[PDB]
C-alpha cells in the first residue's frame, strides 16, 4: 500500500519543515533586533533624570554658565590674553557638572580612604548602573551569579598625584583608583555579575562603539543582558590648555553647528548608560521596551592629511554598511542625529557626506539636528546622549529645536533641498509608516560609528480593567534613617504631583522592584489621602500608624503553636470563604475529621455570632489551615516549640503524621480527654532537636527560648487570634542575648483581612522574607515608574 | 508522468540540497576555525 503516493509526501513535508527551521535560525542569528529597557544620564546643568533632559530640550534652553571654583584650579593665570604663553587656556566658559566633587562611600562597601582614592568616572558609573537597574524594575540584588555584560567608554586622563611620589595615608589604592579596567571591574564586583566586563577607549566615539559590542554578544548568545555606557569628566584644566595650542577651541565655548560663525567645538562632561536585552527574551518576561536597535556599523577613515583630518568616503561607506545590515533603504529615515561638532572644516565635509548618502533618492525632506548646540561637546559621553535624545523625542512625538541655526552656513549648497535644517519644533505623530532615526559619531583618532533606532512595536494596547476589595500593603526601605525620611518625602511629593493612580499599581511597583535594605517601613492605607498623611508623618520623624525597625543580616522566622488561650476565637467565615487556601486546606482537613467525630462543619462554623470534646480537633484544624496559608504566602517555618495541642500541630507541620491521620489522632485524644473533666523540630517536653518520626502513641519555656536564640533565630511568630504569653517572651527579649519580637496574627474579633495586612506589615518590619508575587499574583496591577534612590553625598577631593 | 515519481523526486532532491547548504552555512557562521599566518615579538633577554 501507499505506492509512490504517501511515502514521498511525508519526506517532502519533513524536509520543508527542516529547511524552514534552519532558515529561521539563520535569520535570528544574523539580524535579531535588540530592545532598550531603561536609560540613565547625567548632563551639564541641572539635568539628573531623562525627564529633565526632555523638558530642557522641549523648552529650548542651553546649559553653559562658566567654570568651576571647587576643584582647586588656579583659574587666574589660565588665560593671559596672549594666546601663546605657557599655561594659557582659551575657553572663558563651558558646561561642567556640579556634583562630581561629592560622593557617598557609606552606601557601598567602601572605606573613606580608598573612596578618596577612587576616580570620579567610575564613581559616577556606579550610581548610573544602580539607578538604571532600579529604573528597569529588576531588583539589583537579584542579579547574582548570572551572565550580564558590562561595557564602558572612558578616556584615561589624570586625577591626582603621581604614583612614584605616593601619599601619606592613601598609597596602595592609588593604582587601582586610576585605571580604566577597574571602571568596569568595580561595577562587576559590586553587582556580583559574571558576564564579560570591557572598557574601550576610542576617543569621542567610544560610547557608541561600546553599545556595538553590546549588540553582538547578545546576538551571538554569550550573554542575556548588557549594560553599555560612556563617561567623561575633568578634574584638571590640562585638556583645555593643551587643546588651545591647536587653536581649535572657541573663546566663549558654544557649538554653532552648521552656522556662519563657527569658531570651535568647546568642551563639557557627562555620563550615560543604557540597558539592552534581546527583544524576544524581553517580551517573554514582560520587561518594558522603549526602542529597538537593529543595525550598527564601525569603520576607520584610513590614511588622510593628518590624524585630525576627517574623511567623507569612509562616512558614506559606514552609513551604507549600517543601512545594509539593518536591511532597510535610504528613504526609511525621517531624521538624523549628526555630529555637528561646530568646527570650520568638519561641518562641510559631514554635510556633503550626509547629503550624498541620504538625499539622492528622497521625496520628503530629511530633518537634521545636533544636541551639541544645547550642551556642547561631551567627548566620550556623546553618542549615547544622541541616542537618549532621539528615543525621548520619538516617544514624546515631537522633534526638538537646534540653537544658533538661524544663520545657515555659506560654504555648503542646499539647492537640492532634500535636507532641511531643524530650526523649529516639528510634530512627529504615529502612523502607518514606522518612525526611524540614525545617529553618527566620529572620533579624533579616526574611527566612525553609525547606528539606527526604531520605535517599539505598538502591541501593548489591549489592557482590561478589574476591581477588587483586598487592600495591599505599601513598603519602602533604605540604608539609613535620613535615607528613609527623604525617600518617604519624595514618594509623597510624587504622589501629590500625579493624581488618579490606583493603590494597586503603586503597591505593586513598590513591591518586587526596590531591593531589601536594613531600614524598613510598611503600612496599609484605605485611600491615598490617609496615605499622604502617614507619609508626611514618616517624613517628620515620628512613626505612628506604621511599623519600623532595623534588621541587619536577619532572614529567618520561627513558628510557635500556643495551646489553649485563644478561646472564643471570633468565628471568621470571611477567612473560609474569601481566602481559597482556607477553602481548600481547611475543607480537606474538615472532611477528613467528619467521619470520626460526628460534629459537622455546618453547625458552629456557621457561627452564632450574635468542652474539650469538640474544641481541640477544630483548633487543630484551623491551626493547620492557618499554617498552610502562611507557608504558601512565602514565609517558611523553623523549629517549632508548640505546647500541648501545639505538639500535635508541630507534628503535623514537620511531617510526623498526615493531615487526615493527625486529625484522627487528635479526635481520639479529644474522645479520651473528654471524660476526666467534671524538617527540623525542637522538642518541648524534653527540650532537644529531634527527628519528626519518633512522635508516636507513646509520645501522646525559658531554656528552650534561650537555646533557640543562641542557635541564631531571634524572632517568634505565633498563629493565634490573640497572642498569649507574649509578655513572658517579651520580658525575656531583654533578659538574654538579642532582643525578641512576637507578631500577633488576629485581634479581638477583628477577623477582617485588613488584620492580616497589618500582620504581614509587621512581619516585613523585622527581617522576614516574604514572597510578594505570591501575595499579589492575580490583581491586574501593572508596573508604574517611581523615583530612584536618594543619596547622601559628601565632599571627596584630593588636591594635586 | 510514470506513476507519480516524476515531480516529487526532483522537489525532494532540491529540498535536500537546500537544507544541506543552510546547515553548512550555520556551521561555518558558528565555528569556523581561524588560521594564524605570522607573529612578531619583542621580549626581555635580547629576544627580538
Amino acid at each position, epitope marked *: 500500500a501507499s505506492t509512490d503516493s*504517501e*511515502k514521498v*509526501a511525508e*519526506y517532502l513535508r519533513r*524536509a520543508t519543515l*527542516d529547511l524552514r527551521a534552519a532558515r529561521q535560525r539563520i535569520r535570528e542569528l544574523e539580524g535579531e533586533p535588540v530592545a532598550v529597557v531603561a536609560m540613565a544620564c547625567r548632563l551639564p546643568g541641572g539635568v539628573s533624570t531623562p525627564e529633565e533632559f526632555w523638558e530642557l530640550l522641549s523648552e529650548g534652553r542651553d546649559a553653559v554658565a562658566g567654570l568651576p571654583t571647587d576643584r582647586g584650579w588656579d583659574l587666574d593665570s589660565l588665560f593671559h590674553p596672549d594666546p601663546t604663553r605657557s599655561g594659557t587656556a582659551h575657553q572663558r566658559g563651558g558646561g561642567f557638572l556640579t556634583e562630581a566633587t561629592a560622593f557617598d562611600p557609606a552606601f557601598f562597601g567602601m572605606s573613606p580612604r580608598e573612596a578618596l582614592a577612587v576616580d570620579p568616572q567610575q564613581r559616577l558609573m556606579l550610581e548610573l548602573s544602580w539607578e538604571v537597574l532600579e529604573r528597569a524594575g529588576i531588583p539589583p540584588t537579584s542579579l547574582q551569579a548570572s551572565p550580564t555584560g558590562v561595557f564602558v567608554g572612558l578616556i584615561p586622563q589624570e586625577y591626582g598625584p603621581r604614583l612614584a611620589e605616593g601619599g601619606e595615608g592613601v598609597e596602595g589604592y592609588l593604582m587601582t583608583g586610576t585605571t580604566t579596567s577597574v571602571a568596569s571591574g568595580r561595577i562587576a564586583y559590586t553587582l556580583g555579575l559574571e558576564g564579560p566586563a570591557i572598557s574601550v577607549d576610542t576617543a569621542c566615539s567610544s560610547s557608541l562603539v561600546a553599545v556595538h559590542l553590546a549588540c553582538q554578544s547578545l546576538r551571538r548568545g554569550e550573554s542575556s543582558l548588557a549594560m553599555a555606557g560612556g563617561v567623561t569628566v575633568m578634574p584638571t584644566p590640562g585638556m583645555l590648555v593643551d587643546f588651545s595650542r591647536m587653536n581649535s577651541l572657541a573663546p566663549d565655548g558654544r557649538c554653532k553647528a552648521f552656522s556662519a560663525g563657527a569658531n570651535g567645538f568647546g568642551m563639557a562632561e557627562g555620563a550615560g548608560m543604557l540597558l539592552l536585552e534581546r527583544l524576544s527574551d524581553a517580551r517573554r518576561n514582560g520587561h518594558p521596551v522603549l526602542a529597538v536597535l537593529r543595525g550598527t556599523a564601525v569603520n576607520s577613515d584610513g590614511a588622510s592629511n593628518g590624524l585630525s583630518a576627517p574623511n567623507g568616503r569612509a562616512q558614506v561607506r559606514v552609513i551604507q554598511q549600517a543601512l545594509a545590515e539593518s536591511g532597510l533603504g535610504p528613504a526609511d529615515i525621517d531624521a538624523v542625529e549628526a555630529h555637528g561638532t561646530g568646527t570650520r572644516l568638519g561641518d562641510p565635509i559631514e554635510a556633503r557626506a550626509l547629503f550624498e548618502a541620504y538625499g539622492r533618492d528622497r521625496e520628503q525632506p530629511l530633518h537634521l539636528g545636533s544636541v551639541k548646540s544645547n550642551l556642547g561637546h561631551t567627548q566620550a559621553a556623546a553618542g549615547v546622549a544622541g541616542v537618549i535624545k532621539m528615543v525621548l523625542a520619538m516617544r514624546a512625538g515631537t522633534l526638538p529645536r537646534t540653537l544658533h541655526a538661524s544663520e545657515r552656513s555659506k560654504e555648503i549648497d542646499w539647492s537640492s533641498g532634500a535636507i532641511s535644517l531643524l530650526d523649529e519644533p516639528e510634530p512627529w505623530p504615529a502612523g502607518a509608516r514606522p518612525r526611524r532615526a540614525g545617529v553618527s559619531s566620529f572620533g579624533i583618532s579616526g574611527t566612525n560609528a553609525h547606528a539606527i533606532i526604531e520605535e517599539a512595536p505598538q502591541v501593548v494596547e489591549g489592557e482590561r480593567v478589574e476591581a477588587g476589595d483586598v487592600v495591599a500593603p505599601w513598603v519602602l526601605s533604605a540604608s539609613s534613617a535620613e535615607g528613609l525620611r527623604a525617600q518617604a518625602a519624595r514618594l509623597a511629593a510624587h504622589l501629590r504631583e500625579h493624581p488618579g493612580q490606583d493603590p494597586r499599581d503603586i503597591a505593586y511597583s513598590l513591591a518586587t522592584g526596590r531591593a531589601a535594605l536594613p531600614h524598613r517601613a510598611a503600612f496599609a492605607p484605605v485611600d491615598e489621602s490617609a496615605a499622604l498623611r502617614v507619609l508626611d508623618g514618616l517624613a517628620t520623624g515620628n512613626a505612628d500608624g506604621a511599623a519600623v525597625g532595623t534588621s541587619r543580616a536577619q532572614q529567618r522566622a520561627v513558628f510557635v503553636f500556643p495551646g489553649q488561650g485563644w478561646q472564643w476565637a471570633g468565628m471568621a467565615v470571611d477567612l473560609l470563604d474569601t481566602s481559597p487556601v482556607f477553602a481548600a486546606a481547611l475543607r480537606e482537613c474538615a472532611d477528613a475529621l467528619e467521619p470520626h467525630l460526628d460534629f459537622e462543619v455546618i453547625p458552629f462554623l456557621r457561627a452564632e455570632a450574635a468542652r474539650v470534646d469538640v474544641v481541640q480537633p477544630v483548633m487543630f484544624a484551623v491551626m493547620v489551615s492557618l499554617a498552610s496559608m502562611w507557608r504558601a504566602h512565602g514565609v517558611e517555618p523553623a523549629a517549632v516549640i508548640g505546647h500541648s495541642q501545639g505538639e500535635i500541630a508541630a507534628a503535623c507541620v514537620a511531617g510526623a503524621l498526615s493531615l487526615d491521620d493527625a486529625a484522627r489522632v487528635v479526635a481520639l485524644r479529644s474522645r479520651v480527654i473528654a471524660t476526666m473533666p467534671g524538617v527540623p523540630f525542637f522538642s518541648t517536653v524534653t527540650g532537644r532537636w529531634t527527628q519528626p518520626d519518633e512522635l508516636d502513641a507513646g509520645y501522646w519555656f525559658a531554656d528552650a527560648v534561650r537555646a533557640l536564640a543562641e542557635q541564631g533565630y531571634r524572632t517568634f511568630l505565633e498563629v493565634s487570634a490573640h497572642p498569649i504569653l507574649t509578655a513572658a517572651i517579651e520580658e525575656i527579649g531583654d533578659g538574654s542575648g538579642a532582643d525578641l519580637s512576637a507578631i500577633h496574627s488576629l485581634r479581638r474579633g477583628d477577623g477582617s483581612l485588613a488584620d492580616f495586612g497589618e500582620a504581614l506589615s509587621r512581619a516585613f518590619a523585622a527581617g522576614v522574607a516574604v514572597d510578594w508575587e505570591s501575595v499579589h499574583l492575580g490583581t491586574g496591577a501593572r508596573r508604574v515608574p517611581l523615583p530612584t534612590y536618594p543619596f547622601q553625598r559628601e565632599r571627596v577631593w584630593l588636591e594635586p | 508522468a510514470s506513476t507519480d515519481s516524476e515531480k516529487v523526486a526532483e522537489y525532494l532532491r532540491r529540498a535536500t540540497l537546500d537544507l544541506r547548504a543552510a546547515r553548512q552555512r550555520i556551521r561555518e557562521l558558528e565555528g569556523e576555525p581561524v588560521a594564524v599566518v605570522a607573529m612578531a615579538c619583542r621580549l626581555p633577554g635580547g629576544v627580538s
Partner: antibody
Amino acid sequence: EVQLVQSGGGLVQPGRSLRLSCTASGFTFGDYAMSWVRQAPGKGLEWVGFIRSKAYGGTTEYAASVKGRFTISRDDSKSIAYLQMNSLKTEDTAVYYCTRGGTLFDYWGQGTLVTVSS
Amino acid sequence: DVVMTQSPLSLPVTPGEPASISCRSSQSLLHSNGYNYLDWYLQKPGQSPQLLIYLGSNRASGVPDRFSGSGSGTDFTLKISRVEAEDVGVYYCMQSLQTPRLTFGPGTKVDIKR
C-alpha cells in the same frame, strides 16, 4: 509545539468497550494521517493500526489479532482521532501511543495505561 | 517478504570517545529513484520514542547533533562522535520498502561501561 495530549484509560473487566482520544493541535490536521501503536510491559513496540487521510480516501488498515474488535474514528471537525474498544481480554494490557505519520513516525504522544483484569 | 534487519545487540559505552552501531539487511533498500528507505528511532528509559535519522542520512530538526548516519543500501551505520550520559536507551533500525510493518524488532541496548 504540535502537542497531542492523549486522554482516557482506566481499568475494565474482560468483555467491555472504551474510548481513547487523540487531540491534534498546533498544526493543520487536514492531511496528517495518524496511527496507533502499542507497547506491552516488558517487551518492544508493536504496531496496532493507522487511518489514512481524507484526501486519499480516508480508509484504514488493521494488523490481525485486533482486526475484528478495533475501530478508528477520524473526526475532522475537532481534529480528533478515536480508538474504540470491543470485548477486551487480559493480554491486551499495554501502553497506547498516538503517532502522527503513516510511514514516517513523527512526533509521538504521551501514552495511556489501560489494564484489563478481574 | 522482508529483509530481516538485525543489529549487533547490546553495546556498552563510556563518556568521551565515540561509538557506532551497524545495521545489515538481506534485500537492498536502495529504491529506483535513488534513495534509501531506512530510518532510526531512539527510546529513552521511561519516555516516549523519538526520531533521529530518516532516509539513510538526514538529521531531523531538534536533534542535539553528534549523530551521523551513513552507508549504502545494505550496510547502514549510525555513529555518535561524542558519548554523553543521557543518550542511553534503546535504538531501533526501521525500513520502508514494506508498508505492513508489524513490529519494531528487538533493538540494541546501551549502558555505561564498567
